[PDB]
């Protein structure tokens, strides 16, 4: 089962990126290092 997800910056809680993931292959909430335009620096973004 593949579904679209939103990645939110853990620092400013800004819903920054849109992506998708296969729930079966990645049961746990995805986490990436992505640029946060509000803070203008790379930060940890976690799926909500």
């Amino acid at each position: 089962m593949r579904v679209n997800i939103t990645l939110e910056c853990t620092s400013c809680k800004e819903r920054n990126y849109l992506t998708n993931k296969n729930k079966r292959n990645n049961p746990d909430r995805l986490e990436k290092q992505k640029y946060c335009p509000r803070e203008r620096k790379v930060t940890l973004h976690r799926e909500t």
Binding site: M1, K23, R24, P27, D28
Partner: protein, 235 residues
């Protein structure tokens, strides 16, 4: 206790889907469901340990007495008395209060306002949990389930499954709670011990939610039965 549009999904396997429930006060609610249905998970939501993915779970401000399905032994060397004493926050506040006095001596005129307020609350909170409990707990064992005092000085990890259940149940009562959340309170108890638990729960004036797989035990106490469905993910 009320929950609306409850949603919770661990990975790919979901627990609640748009579930709802309203429990009136002073209701001895019997929670029933197959293993894995999500009965323990409901309490975790009430205790705010878990958060619903979507929806609102509403709990009253009253103090809650929680009896975990599994015994929580923080350290192997913990004694039964230490385990029971941890039920009340007397020891924790005193350690904080003792530190507050230390800070007062070090700091002269900077943090006194903050320290004085913290000291006052601890004293008022300490008196609310009357420090006379040291004697009451010692005798709560006698009147509760005939728990011998030799066990009182023995490591908790060395007790038998039935003995551990008695200690954990007494700890919940020792805390003097307002709402009782009992998760299989008679898992290992023998026939004689179950009688005391049943009588106490019949007499208990407050609200008590019971997760139990013992039909006969529930029937003597329960007035409202809450069924957690495993296939419909509803309540």
């Amino acid at each position: 206790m009320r929950g609306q549009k409850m949603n919770l999904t661990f990975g790919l396997e979901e627990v609640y889907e748009d579930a709802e429930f309203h429990l009136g006060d002073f209701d001895k609610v019997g929670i029933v469901g197959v293993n894995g249905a999500g009965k323990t998970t409901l309490f975790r939501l009430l205790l705010r340990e878990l958060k619903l993915d979507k929806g609102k779970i509403t709990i009253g401000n009253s103090r809650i007495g929680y009896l975990p399905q599994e015994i929580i032994i923080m350290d192997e060397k913990m004694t039964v008395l230490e385990f029971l004493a941890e039920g009340r926050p007397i020891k924790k506040m005193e350690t904080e209060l003792n530190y507050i006095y230390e800070k007062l001596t070090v700091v002269d005129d900077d943090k006194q306002d903050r320290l004085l307020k913290r000291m006052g609350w601890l004293q008022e909170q300490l008196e609310y949990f009357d420090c006379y409990e040291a004697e009451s707990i010692l005798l709560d064992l006698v009147d509760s389930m005939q728990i011998d005092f030799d066990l009182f000085d023995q490591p908790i990890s060395e007790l038998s499954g039935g003995q551990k259940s008695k200690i954990s149940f007494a700890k919940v009562l020792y805390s003097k709670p307002e709402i009782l959340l009992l998760d299989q309170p008679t898992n290992h108890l023998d026939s004689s011990t179950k009688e005391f638990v049943t009588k106490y729960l019949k007499s208990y004036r407050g609200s008590v939610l019971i997760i139990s797989h013992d039909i006969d035990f529930l029937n003597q106490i329960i007035d409202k039965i809450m069924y957690i469905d495993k296939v419909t993910h509803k309540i």
